[PDB]
Design a protein around this ligand. Structure first.
Ligand SMILES: *[C@@H]1O[C@H](CO)[C@@H](O)[C@H](O)[C@H]1NC(C)=O
Ligand SMILES: *[C@H]1O[C@H](CO)[C@H](O)[C@H](O)[C@H]1NC(C)=O
Lengths: 39, 392
């Protein structure tokens, strides 16, 4: 009933918790402050 | 057979742009066509190859500060979330920055249109390419193949990368509407197209940026004026209103029909179970005026392979814009690589293009009439010969 909600979130496209993105134009980018983990 | 809209290569090429199953190949209302592994876990990923004109995510946050109900707002920090309380504030926009503090999103088009790493011929293509050239890093700081969707704001000329790839969330079990119930983290939200608002926003997966010039010729970016989508059967073009599975709805305006082609319940959607529509769905439609003068919207999942001429009609797809006109932010500067316009593709001259009649379709007692009017191909259905009417 809480795992189901999680599964629903994953099924709805909830993404991975990542610290860094790599962009070819501007290089690596990171959040300056901790992002809300639920996002 | 003898479908004039398949008569030659150019014509086929023109008509093929309307096959969203072939070119887009993913959900449209909700696009989650691919699966990618990050840190040992599988995640769903938007994968559609065509940009979706006018698509935005409507949010249902409370109508009080600090909530803005705008999915292009930055994703919230934990601090902001703690400060607001439930539900999550902010939006879907990626808020990451370079070590020097430069935003990756939103990103101005001026910085893309003269850059080395960007080879797309149009602004939208440049935004898409910018998105395609952005990937998630894993725990070991290795590049994955997980990419984020984008929104191009063509009025502000700003390219947005969305950190949130979700597109629909509903049900009191999962999310709140205007803060009710207050125990839930997530606000509810859904994809929308509006009769008046946000026509300038173009939603896409990163993968329209994989070949950033393709969409110009392979996607149905604009509405088609003066024609009804149709399917070629028994020697003539049947517009959707002649097909039994077609959904016909009343509308006050053509914009409502355009919205309906995207928002009706049969549109290609990957929303849950992890369905892959592959672009199949009730994606096609047109506005038309009935015999009494009232506006109607015909909706179908049949990929169009012919057209019926009707000057007051307008044909839409879930992917395309409301407007019939091609905007400059998808026109390449080099004239030699622009695709044929609908006027060009459907052109004819009366002295080289003969009026023709097809054989009688006895089941409907109608036959194809194909001709040239105003330098454009007219395709209609008319009565069979008096002789033929006996067989009906
Ligand atoms: C549309 O594309 C799909 C996938 O390529 C194909 O199976 C289908 O026959 C096409 N429909 C047309 C061209 O009407
Ligand atoms: C495409 O449009 C350009 C102008 O933007 C030129 O008119 C060119 O001749 C067109 N080519 C096609 C294929 O119609």
């Amino acid at each position: 009933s809480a795992s189901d909600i999680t599964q629903h979130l994953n099924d709805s496209g909830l993404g991975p918790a990542v610290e860094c993105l790599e962009n070819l134009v501007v290089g690596p980018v990171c959040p300056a402050a901790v992002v809300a983990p639920a996002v | 057979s003898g479908n004039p809209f398949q008569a030659n290569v150019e014509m086929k090429t023109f008509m093929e742009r309307f096959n969203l199953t072939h070119h887009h190949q993913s959900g449209i209302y909700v696009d989650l066509g691919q699966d990618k592994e990050v840190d040992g876990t599988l995640y769903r990923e938007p994968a559609g190859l065509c940009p979706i004109w006018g698509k935005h995510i409507e949010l249902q946050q409370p109508d009080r500060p600090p909530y803005r109900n705008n999915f292009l707002e930055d994703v919230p920090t934990e601090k902001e979330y703690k400060q607001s309380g439930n539900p999550l504030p902010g939006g879907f926009n990626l808020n990451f920055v370079t070590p020097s503090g430069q935003r990756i999103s939103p990103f101005p088009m001026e910085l893309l249109e003269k850059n080395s790493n960007i080879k797309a011929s149009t602004d939208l293509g440049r935004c898409a390419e910018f998105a395609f050239k952005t990937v998630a890093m894993d725990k070991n700081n290795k590049a994955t193949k997980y990419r984020y969707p984008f929104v191009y704001d063509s009025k502000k000329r700003l390219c947005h990368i969305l950190y949130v790839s979700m597109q629909l969330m509903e049900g009191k079990k999962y999310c709140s509407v205007k803060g009710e119930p207050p125990d839930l983290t997530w606000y509810c939200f859904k994809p929308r197209k509006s009769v008046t608002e946000n026509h300038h926003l173009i939603y896409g997966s990163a993968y329209v940026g994989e070949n950033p010039d393709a969409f110009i010729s392979k996607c149905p970016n604009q509405a088609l004026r003066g024609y009804r989508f149709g399917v070629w059967k028994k020697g003539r073009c049947l517009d959707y209103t002649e097909l039994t599975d077609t959904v016909i709805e009343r509308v006050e305006s053509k914009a409502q029909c355009w919205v309906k082609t995207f928002e009706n319940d049969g549109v290609a959607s990957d929303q849950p179970d992890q369905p892959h529509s592959g672009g199949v769905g009730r994606n096609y439609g047109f506005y038309y005026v009935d015999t009494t003068g009232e506006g109607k919207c015909a909706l179908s999942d049949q990929v169009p392979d012919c057209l019926v001429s009707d000057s007051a009609a307008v044909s839409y797809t879930a992917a395309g814009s409301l407007s019939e006109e091609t905007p400059n932010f998808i026109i390449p500067s080099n004239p030699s690589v622009t695709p044929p316009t609908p006027e060009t593709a459907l052109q004819c001259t009366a002295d080289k293009f003969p009026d023709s009649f097809g054989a009688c379709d006895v089941q409907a007692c109608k036959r194809q009439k194909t001709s040239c009017v105003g330098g454009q191909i007219q395709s209609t259905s008319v009565d069979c010969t008096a002789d033929e009417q006996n067989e009906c």
